[PDB]
């Protein structure tokens, strides 16, 4: 299977630089182009160029011409994307996506790169213990609170993958103090509260913090 | 983007066809391959038609792609909820020597059953009062359409410092969802006898209370 | 250069 793998999410001052990495796996990689695509917030698809791997010709859109350099390792089959002059109009998501049958037919998981003067703020994680009263019949609701983290994103898994059905993660506020904080919640069984264990998963790779948090009954 | 003009919205009742038209000029369209692209709410762009007609595996039939002349036009039968997306055109332009991208398509279904909405209220964790702070959380999901207002009151009178409420973001099983915050201090929150979040909803409320107790 | 530009139109060209 093609697969495309991305740097984590960061962190960048302005003025700053950052390079972006893409690892591709399953498929020759000097056989085939390279774009990368960046997505504003909200915002349509930005084609930002094309790097050929086997002789690492390179051509950039006309928007990010003086500021993108990619590059490429073949003997890693990783290609680079590195945006200098980092500006607070440059926080995006940032894609690569291998250029195959003459489009973008298999795209990376996508980069956060957020610009910012402030600085990166680990997530403290609190339980969302299920009451009693709060409950609804036979199901229950309970989940983790992930507050006051600089930047997006965080991401949310329960029992290390191994439980998906109910789950819920919410998508973060904002708050005047300039940090996220979100909450995510799967929905149980009532009676299996007691015997079955639920440990939230919370990564934020930008501060490189994970944090797995045990939720008790009430 | 802008030499591939797309539609800003398009729409139809669930079983129906909807149209995509994408617009450009023999520098684009009218000489080279035409992709198109979908991005599910909260997700990666994915290639959806390569090659102006041709579908990867995965993609389900009732989409097409053609193209004539200088413009590229996908289709959709038997829309359903789950093709609610972004959609993309894009094509590479040899006066500029750039793959473009057209602006983004959005597919709504219309006639979607009324959702009433859920609402779950979280009073601080114990951790979070041993840590000086106290936050309640107020989880609204499950409800359509995706405008939804929320009221906090302090036992019977409303607070308005410390709300922090998100915008309604549309779930994976279309529907929507939001999310409600009140900051307190942990003094705040064990003088009052009850707090309350109240979510308004196409004219009716839904309200959940929590107790210090 | 244009022979990338080139090299590219004539990959797009349908």
């Known amino acids: 299977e093609v697969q495309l793998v991305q740097s984590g999410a960061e962190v960048k001052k302005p003025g700053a630089s950052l390079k972006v990495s893409c690892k591709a796996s399953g498929y020759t990689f000097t056989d085939y182009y390279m774009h990368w695509v960046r997505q504003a917030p909200g915002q349509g698809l930005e084609w930002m160029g094309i790097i050929k791997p086997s002789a690492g010709n390179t051509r950039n859109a006309q928007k990010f011409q003086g500021r993108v350099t990619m590059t490429r390792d073949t003997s890693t089959s990783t290609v680079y994307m590195e945006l200098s002059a980092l500006r607070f109009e440059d926080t995006a998501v940032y894609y690569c996506?291998?250029?195959?049958?003459?489009?973008?037919?298999?795209w990376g998981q996508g980069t956060l790169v957020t610009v910012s003067s402030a600085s990166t703020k680990g997530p403290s994680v609190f339980p969302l213990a299920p009451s009693s009263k709060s409950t609804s019949g036979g199901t229950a609701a309970l989940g983790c609170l992930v507050k006051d983290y600089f930047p997006e994103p965080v991401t949310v898994s329960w029992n290390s993958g191994a439980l998906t059905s109910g789950v819920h993660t919410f998508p973060a506020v904002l708050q005047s103090s300039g940090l996220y904080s979100l909450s995510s919640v799967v929905t149980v069984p009532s009676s299996s509260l007691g015997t079955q264990t639920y440990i939230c998963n919370v990564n934020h790779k930008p501060s490189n913090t994970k944090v797995d948090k045990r939720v008790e009954p009430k | 983007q802008s030499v591939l003009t797309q539609p800003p919205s398009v729409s139809a009742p669930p079983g129906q066809k909807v149209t995509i038209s994408c617009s450009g000029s023999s520098s684009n369209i009218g000489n080279n391959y035409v992709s198109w692209y979908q991005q599910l709410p909260g997700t990666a762009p994915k290639l959806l038609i390569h090659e102006n007609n041709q579908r990867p595996s995965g993609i389900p039939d009732r989409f097409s792609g053609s193209k004539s002349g200088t413009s590229a036009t996908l289709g959709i039968t038997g829309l359903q909820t789950g093709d609610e997306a972004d959609y993309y055109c894009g094509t590479w332009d040899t006066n500029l020597g750039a793959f473009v991208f057209g602006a983004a398509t959005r597919v709504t279904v219309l006639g979607q059953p009324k959702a009433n909405p859920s609402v779950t209220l979280f009073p601080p964790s114990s951790e979070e009062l041993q840590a000086n702070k106290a936050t309640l959380v107020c989880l609204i999901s499950d409800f359509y359409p995706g405008a939804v207002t929320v009221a906090w009151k302090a036992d019977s009178s409303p607070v308005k410092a410390g709300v922090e409420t998100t915008t309604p973001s549309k779930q994976s099983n279309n529907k929507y969802a939001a999310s409600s915050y009140l900051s307190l201090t942990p003094e705040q929150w064990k003088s009052h006898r009850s707090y309350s979040c109240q979510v308004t909803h196409e004219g009716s409320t839904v309200e959940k209370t929590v107790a210090p107790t | 250069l244009d022979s990338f530009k080139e090299e590219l139109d004539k990959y797009f060209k349908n």
């Open positions: 996506a291998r250029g195959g049958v003459h489009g973008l037919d298999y």
